[PDB]
């Protein structure tokens, strides 16, 4: 919810979009087409994986029995051992739940961030030839074909080729 994109002004996600986290759905003269972005999907996924590799770490740290399950140790030292072990249980349990909640907050906002980085980039590409409607869409103010879409996607679309055309077409 941090950036406003996911579960914000984009209304929802697309259950038909198998091949990515982020992608494109277009409507023009020819037809309607969908394809997921690689460059930003990879980007998020890679940050998730980089989180995992950090926690799925194995402690190289060994512990031995100070205790005895078969013949109980003397009772006073028994009581200090148990009190220490439980205190460690408190600390670690708090650490576990805090660590996980925080990673989760950050993961979610990591996703919001990358969406709202796809958006703002495409916006930047198109300069003055289209408009923010505000549901995560750009109304294009010039006719455009399916090889024009692809040039937006893989980031080659030239603006000053369609500038005048689309500009009078906003009055």
């Amino acid at each position: 919810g941090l950036f406003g994109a996911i579960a914000g002004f984009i209304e929802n996600g697309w259950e038909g979009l198998i091949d990515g986290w982020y992608g494109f759905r277009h409507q023009n003269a020819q037809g309607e087409g969908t394809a997921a972005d690689y460059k930003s999907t990879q980007s998020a996924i890679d940050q998730i994986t980089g989180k995992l590799n950090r926690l799925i770490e194995k402690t190289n740290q060994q512990f031995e029995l100070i205790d005895n399950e078969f013949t109980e140790v003397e009772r006073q030292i028994g009581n200090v051992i148990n009190w220490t072990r439980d205190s460690m249980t408190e600390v670690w349990s708090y650490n576990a739940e805090l660590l996980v909640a925080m990673e989760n907050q950050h993961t979610i906002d990591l996703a919001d961030s990358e969406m709202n980085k796809l958006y703002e980039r495409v916006k930047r590409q198109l300069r003055e030839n289209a408009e923010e409607d505000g549901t995560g869409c750009f109304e294009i103010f010039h006719k455009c074909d399916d090889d024009c879409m692809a040039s937006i996607r893989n980031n080659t679309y030239d603006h000053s080729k369609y500038r005048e055309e689309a500009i009078q077409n906003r009055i």
Partner: nanobody
Framework: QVQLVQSGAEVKKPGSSVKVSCKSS????????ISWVRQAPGQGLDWMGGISPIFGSTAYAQKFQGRVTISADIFSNTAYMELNSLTSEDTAVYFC??????????????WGQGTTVTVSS
């Protein structure tokens, strides 16, 4: 530079199951899709399915659905393929291969060394 290292040759009796492993060494493959592709003796490459474990996808070729299990342990950087109810039609070399990205469309650019499975009495 990641290498994929597969488990060793298997000799199996008809009806048994075989589970082959593919370990990613020199780096993780968890952010990519890995496919399993088999090659029957004298025959061509044949896709079995794949997995992209962080992405959260497991896919199967229709011709092997229900008979094959593809899985992954992200923590050991290992992918697995288990094929059940083996017959001689399943004698083949089995390869794991990593795609250029998290899904199965991209060309497969990293390959394991292969694991021979022989189904014989």
């Amino acid at each position: 530079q990641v290498q994929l290292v597969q488990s060793g040759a298997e000799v199996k009796k008809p009806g048994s199951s075989v589970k082959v492993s593919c370990k990613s060494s020199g780096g993780t493959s968890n952010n990519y899709a890995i496919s399993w592709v088999r090659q029957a003796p004298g025959q061509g490459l044949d896709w079995m399915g794949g997995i992209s474990p962080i992405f959260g996808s497991t896919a199967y070729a229709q011709k092997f659905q229900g008979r094959v299990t593809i899985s992954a342990d992200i923590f050991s950087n290992t992918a697995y393929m288990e094929l059940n109810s083996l017959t001689s039609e399943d004698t083949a070399v089995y390869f794991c291969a990593r795609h250029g990205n998290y899904y199965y469309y991209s060309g497969m650019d990293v390959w394991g060394q292969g694991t021979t499975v022989t189904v014989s009495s």
